[PDB]
RNA sequence: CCCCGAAAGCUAUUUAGGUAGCGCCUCGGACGAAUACCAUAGGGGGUAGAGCACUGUUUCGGCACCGAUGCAAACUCCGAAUACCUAUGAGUACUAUCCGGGAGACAGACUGCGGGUGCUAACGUCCGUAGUCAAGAGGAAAACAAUCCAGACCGCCAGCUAAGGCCCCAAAAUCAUAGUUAAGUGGGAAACGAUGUGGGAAGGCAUAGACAGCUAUAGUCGAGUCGGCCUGCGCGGAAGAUGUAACGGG
């Protein structure tokens, strides 16, 4: 409840180089959620609300809420991906929790 | 003056330099460190100026960690020779540098003076640099 | 002066006859320094490690054994 | 044959008079070079002067943008050694405001004989009085 | 007056104004710190 | 079934299967408008050479 | 007068600006689908990248090993894209192959990509690969073999376009809509320096009154104020010899 970020469903046409390049010059970040008991959901995300997350510590000890449409998964943080030269993040990995 | 104690060969081709840090650009030793965020290459004199620089500033009061070691021998003709007849004799040492590479990393200081410190040893370096710090991941 | 300069002349190693060709007994299928390669069923081997067929067939490389050998052979 | 070339005999020069007065001066000169070559005549012909007469008044409230009536530099060189001469468009607007309109117009008409023929049909006067009243010109806005 | 590619204030009393399209520094305590951008 | 396959740049100074695939759908100069069968024999030189030929279906 | 049309490479040479065989050109004869492009299908690899399992090399800890951390043309536990070989197939194309007559050529150049050498110098030098020139005119780039567009059988005072352009020299918009710049930036250049001006995200304090100034934290004063981050376009750094001369000119 403490933290939520609301995201888009990532469809196999937004998959790839040059949709995750076009995605990032549009300041949207690909994402992942894997896990338990069912496969893997390909989503989308805010740079300005990931970065405002990833600021707070308990963020990364906490279970958030990623919303996308109506659904709802309850999930941890699990791996993420920064530029080499700029810190920006530039993927995430989720895992069902 | 870092240097490599033996050398399987004495010299070894010009090369190219491309492509991102990938390895080497996270925090892992203290909890403040400075990385390159232009390629380029280090030499060892630079390499030295830049450490005597930090220590002085922070004044021996924690640990400096140096994360380049150059290992790549540069050579260069004598002077009033023509081309050919050779390749040339080794003259210094560098490290290759890709933007992202992390160059030191301060442990045990106050951050304003680790900043001050790093801001005197960037002055130094032929290559533009940025300060991080030690984050969850 | 330099104490470099040499090299030695080229040996024109390498593989002759690729898989699903077509081959009649005594056609040369690889030249190796070494065993890179070993001998099937059909295939012959020489004195400097030359694989060779020894019946007209279809040229197939695998990877058998418990030492994963890379084999090929020749199928009629 | 059947496309014509005009005849000098039967060219026709008309007169006309522009007022300069808050004119941005290479805006102004691009009409008035265009006019003087003809090229808004429809018997325009390029080895013909087909164009008309133009009076300049007020010469000197011609305008400049920017800082170019203090930074526009006019250079002339006398051919002795060192003799590079160099004003600017403030002192020369003040002092010979022909000069200004002759060099704009002069650069922007072909550099032959026909250019110099070309160039005499343009009078340039300081003042706003003009001694071409016998010719009657028309007022022209541009 | 210094005059120099780097101006940069010294002390408290320093200012940094912008004249004619040039950086300057000028001090209302020490007339030593007077520097020109050039 | 079939489609119209025009050819709009010059093709002298191009790789040489790239002229290959032009000739072997049978254009000939710049402007030169073909018809051949949808197959994807024919679609992989048409593909081979998109940047200096215009396709309708 | 008509048709086709190279090469400046390999190998050897008292050979290196010569020559010979092969590669590349042309002509005659034989033979036709045996050829190529592309699509499917089969196949081997050790390069780009990456990695530390071997060989070397590197930093910091712990007690030669152990844990974190880098590097490699002559390292590899891994490993592409392309390229190369083979088979089948549609469409398109005078394609492959064999036998003979005649040659020329064996000084190359620039540009892009992958490299050695050099100083990640040279219109430098040596390879691989592709284009152009050589042996190729026309239009663009001020002028400019090798860049861009494009391949000139002859004639026309007809039309459409490519690169590139449309104020005048000089053909075509002083065209339309929305913003930015004030430096003639545009129309040469770095580390670095700076309240230049747009845009964006976040933070601190504030009408129980914030900042500056003023009166010896209290006090008049009556709205915003302060300091950083990302980003667009600008400023300084910026000195040479015949004459403006670093938009072709206006
Ligand atoms: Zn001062």
């Known amino acids: 409840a403490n933290f939520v970020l609301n995201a888009q469903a990532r469809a196999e046409d937004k998959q790839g180089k040059g949709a995750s390049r076009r995605l990032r010059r549009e300041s949207l970040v690909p994402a992942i959620i894997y896990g338990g008991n069912a496969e893997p959901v390909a989503v989308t995300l805010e740079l300005r609300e990931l970065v405002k997350a990833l600021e707070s510590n308990v963020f990364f000890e906490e279970v958030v809420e990623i919303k996308v449409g109506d659904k709802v998964e309850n999930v941890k943080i699990q791996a993420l991906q920064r530029h080499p030269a700029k810190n920006t993040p530039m993927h995430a990995d989720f895992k069902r929790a | 003056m870092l240097q490599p104690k033996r050398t399987k060969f004495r010299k070894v081709h010009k090369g190219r330099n491309t492509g991102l840090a990938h390895r080497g650009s996270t925090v892992s030793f203290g909890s403040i460190a400075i990385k390159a965020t232009e390629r380029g290459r280090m030499t060892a004199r630079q390499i030295e100026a830049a450490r005597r620089t930090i220590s002085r500033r922070i004044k021996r009061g924690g640990k400096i960690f140096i994360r380049v070691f150059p290992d790549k021998p540069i050579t260069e003709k004598p002077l009033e020779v023509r081309m050919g007849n050779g390749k040339g004799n080794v003259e210094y040492w560098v490290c290759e540098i890709k933007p992202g590479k992390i160059l030191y990393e301060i442990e045990g200081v106050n951050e304003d003076l680790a900043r001050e410190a790093f801001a005197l040893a960037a002055a130094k370096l032929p290559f533009k640099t940025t300060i991080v710090t030690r984050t969850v991941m | 002066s330099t104490k470099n300069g040499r090299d030695s002349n080229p040996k024109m190693l390498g593989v002759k006859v690729y898989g699903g060709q077509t081959v009649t007994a005594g056609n040369i299928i690889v030249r190796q320094r070494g065993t890179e390669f070993h001998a099937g069923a059909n295939v012959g081997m020489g004195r400097d490690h030359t694989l060779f067929a020894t019946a007209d067939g279809v040229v197939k490389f695998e990877v058998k054994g418990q030492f994963g050998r890379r084999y090929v052979k020749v199928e009629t | ?142 | 007056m210094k005059v120099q590619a780097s101006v940069k204030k010294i002390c408290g009393s320093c200012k940094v104004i912008r004249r004619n399209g040039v950086i300057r520094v000028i001090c209302s305590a020490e007339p030593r710190h007077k520097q020109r951008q050039g | 079934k079939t489609i119209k396959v025009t050819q709009t740049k010059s093709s002298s100074h191009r790789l040489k299967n790239h002229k290959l695939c032009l000739q072997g759908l049978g254009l000939r100069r710049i402007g030169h408008t073909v018809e051949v069968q949808d197959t994807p024999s024919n679609r992989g030189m048409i593909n081979k050479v998109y940047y200096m030929v215009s396709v309708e279906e």
């Not at chain 4, 006019?35 to 007020?58: M, Q």
């Not at chain 4, 002795?80 to 002069?106: C, D, Q, S, W, Y």
């Not at chain 4, 072909?110 to 003042?127: F, S, T």
């Open chain 4, 1 to 142: 044959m059947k496309t014509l070339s005009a005849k000098p005999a039967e060219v026709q020069h008309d007169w006309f008079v522009v007022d300069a007065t808050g004119k941005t001066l290479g805006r102004l000169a691009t009409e008035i070079a265009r006019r003087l070559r003809g090229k808004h005549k429809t018997s325009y012909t390029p080895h013909v002067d087909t164009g008309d007469y133009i009076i300049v008044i007020n010469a000197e409230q011609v305008q400049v943008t920017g800082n170019k009536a203090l930074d526009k530099k006019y250079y002339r060189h006398t051919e002795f050694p060192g003799g590079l001469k160099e004003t600017n468009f403030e002192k020369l607007v003040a002092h010979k405001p022909e000069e200004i309109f002759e060099r704009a117009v002069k650069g922007m008409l072909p550099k032959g004989p026909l250019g110099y023929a070309m160039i005499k049909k343009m009078k340039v006067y300081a003042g706003s009085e003009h001694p071409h009243a016998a010719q009657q010109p028309q007022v022209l806005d541009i």
